[PDB]
Design a protein around this ligand. Structure first.
Ligand SMILES: O=c1[nH]c(=O)n(COCCO)cc1Cc1ccccc1
Ligand SMILES: O=c1[nH]c(=O)n(COCCO)cc1Cc1ccccc1
Ligand SMILES: [Co+2]
Ligand SMILES: [Co+2]
Ligand SMILES: [Co+2]
Ligand SMILES: [Co+2]
Ligand SMILES: [Mg+2]
Ligand SMILES: [Mg+2]
Lengths: 293, 293
């Protein structure tokens, strides 16, 4: 049994641990009772996406539906919103490295407090593609920074520390194998670039700020493609680094919404976009069903 | 008249601009009609905080209440949520530098498209204090990074570019003058440190990861205090940098919830916390009333 670890000798010395952004705590809640049975954590941007994911889990796998307390609705608050369906826990993380990092610190502590074991964690979401068809599901093999390097640079106090961004190889391979079973479901494995800015950080020409030319954009993106990058998003490096440090097996599965070699703004009918957006959760549902069979 | 500027020669060349994360666009909406009258933009973390701020604006200043479309509620989505009351626009930004940066790119473009002028923008929120009483409202004079330097480091394509984090001096002074009118309202001007991580980035001992000692935490925080830092949050440097680049007059006003020299977790009664949390909006309401008188 692979228990979820923390890397913090102070944590066990505390009288109580308050997970402020989850609205949970070790004294206020029975965390082993509430979460000890979690085997799969799926994380994504918005409360609504993740609530919908949990409902999909109910419908696809027949797990007990996530309970709703109507006098404490999480959506709209400063908390990360959780929706549990049997052994699957869906959690929102907002946008960007700092936002997901707060959620991950508190989630990893939660799984540790609950004495969970053999947990798989998977990020689902959207991304920009490079040189691949819009609607393609990319399974990340390695997450890279803006310089196409597999690293996450932490600032700890006033010191810079570099961490590796390795994602579980067997898991990425298993997800790719699952994808083969799904018809009309274009999938590939490739590197994923994670940036701190959506606009200039991704070579966009449509921000409030653009200090470079179209030619420089395309050169950057073509070099990224040569390095093996196939999509671009905003959470994968810190996700890979933290999950890796705490011995959790992690994967990233994102659909592309456009080919960035061609444009910066989406030009898809609404119904097609809806179709693309549900593709990662479809793969994850196949995966979980296979694991549990 | 000081119009809101962008720094992007490509923007005017586009047929249409889609502000995806605001759910607005130049073709789908009449942006000058909808927003040309905006003079004050207040930004903060959550949809609920900002909706409440807008209601407070209605009650305090008598501006028309923000309209609610019940078939398209923003809270819970991947969008930044807007609540307009007369010349005041309240907008949510989520947590952290990347999250606020996406909102700022689209907001600055919005104000430009709407031909707004003479706009003041103010971030309100919470923070950790250093060596000052919990509940203190800190008006930022300068925003600094984890190294106590007034800089914001952008990664543009694969290049690092440093930007200044100057906030409008006259504005910070005017807000401080307004605060003097409010009884039972502890306020100070000081530097604000902005970090990419809430836990190790702020010297916390309670994260899933803690790679340093209590002694090192306290030394870091004491050096920050010596530099002039009085509070710690997660958006001020990119906010100051972008607003500055686009010639918008900006300020940051955050209340402290704890003294980080003493603890990492909040220990306040709920009712006291509620009291503290509303302090920045109280100052902003005084400020706006004065400007409009
Ligand atoms: O190009 C992208 N880059 C990216 O980091 N993502 C991930 O989500 C960021 C917030 O929507 C998603 C996309 C696709 C996209 C394109 C235009 C508008 C919205 C999303
Ligand atoms: O110490 C802090 N650091 C900080 O960056 N903020 C700003 O908000 C971050 C998300 O809640 C707020 C605080 C106060 C605090 C302390 C404990 C829990 C929550 C918030
Ligand atoms: Co422990
Ligand atoms: Co490669
Ligand atoms: Co223009
Ligand atoms: Co100083
Ligand atoms: Mg193409
Ligand atoms: Mg003290």
């Amino acid at each position: 049994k692979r228990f979820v670890h923390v890397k913090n000798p102070y944590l066990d010395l505390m009288d109580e641990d308050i997970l402020y952004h989850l609205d949970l705590g070790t004294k206020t809640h029975n965390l082993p009772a509430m979460f000890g049975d979690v085997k799969f954590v799926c994380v994504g941007g918005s409360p609504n996406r993740m609530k919908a994911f949990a409902l999909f889990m109910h419908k696809e796998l027949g797990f007990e539906e996530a309970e709703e307390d109507i006098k404490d609705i999480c959506a709209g608050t400063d908390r990360y919103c959780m929706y549990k369906t049997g052994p699957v826990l869906a959690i929102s993380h907002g946008m960007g490295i700092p936002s997901i990092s707060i959620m991950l610190h508190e989630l990893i502590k939660l799984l540790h407090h609950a004495r969970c074991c053999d947990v798989t964690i998977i990020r689902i979401g959207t991304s920009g593609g490079i040189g691949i068809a819009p609607g393609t599901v990319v399974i990340t093999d390695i997450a890279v920074d803006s310089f196409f390097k597999p690293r996450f640079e932490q600032v700890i106090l006033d010191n810079i520390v570099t961490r590796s961004t390795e994602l579980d190889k067997e898991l990425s391979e298993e997800l790719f194998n699952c994808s083969k079973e799904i018809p009309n479901f274009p999938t590939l494995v490739g590197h994923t670039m994670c940036t701190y800015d959506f606009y200039e950080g991704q070579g966009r020409l449509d921000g409030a700020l653009c200090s470079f030319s179209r030619e420089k954009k395309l050169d950057y993106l073509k070099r990224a493609f040569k390095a093996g990058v196939r999509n671009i998003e905003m959470e994968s490096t810190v996700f890979a680094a933290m999950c890796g440090l705490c011995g959790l097996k992690a994967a990233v599965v994102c659909v592309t919404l456009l080919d960035r070699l061609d444009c910066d703004q989406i030009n898809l009918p609404h119904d097609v976009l809806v179709e693309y957006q549900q593709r990662p959760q479809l793969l994850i549902s196949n995966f979980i069903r296979r694991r549990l069979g």
